[PDB]
């Protein structure tokens, strides 16, 4: 979850 669930 490197984008913290904000983007693909």
């Amino acid at each position, epitope marked *: 979850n*490197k984008e*913290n669930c*904000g983007a693909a």
Partner: antibody
Amino acid sequence: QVRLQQSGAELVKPGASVKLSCTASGFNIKDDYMHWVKQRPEQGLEWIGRIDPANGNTQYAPKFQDKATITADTSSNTAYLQLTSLTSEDTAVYYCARGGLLRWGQGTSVTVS
Amino acid sequence: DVVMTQTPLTLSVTIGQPASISCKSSQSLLHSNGKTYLNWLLQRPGQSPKRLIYLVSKLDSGVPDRFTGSGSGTDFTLKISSVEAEDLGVYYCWQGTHFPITFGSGTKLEI
């Protein structure tokens, strides 16, 4: 507490080139994607691009592939935004943000005089 | 690029009243991986933006449950059950399904 500390306001002449910095506290930037976002009072928010501090891979919005250069340094846990050939439009507040725009820095206000 | 259209653009309301903000995208934000990367930001006056909602309906830490995110595909809505002083500012929806990341033009909530 997680903090994204950005460098101070820049007041520069048309044609120069500034380099903004974003020092992260409370997490490791290599575990995230570091983003940069531009904001103008009328035009609104514009995604500049994104960097993976773990490898250095960058992705830019086509509008800024030319203008902006995003770098990162894991040793100082800091991300950077370099802007070339600043014009009157480049006058804006520039934000850094961690993965998925979860948390943002206080922003660095650039003024092109 | 994905165009994010927010309505209304400005919202002047009384303290305690509910609020509803629309967010429409030019294409589907349902990613092939099966998740919809539509998010909501709040930027208080003089403050920096902050994420309120992610994955259509998930609330970020600290966000009051007066906020509820909903919708699917291209049509999304942010609702506030009761507007408080801390809820004033500009709300931005944005998508992370397709790159480049794009933002709505923002909805100004004031009294």
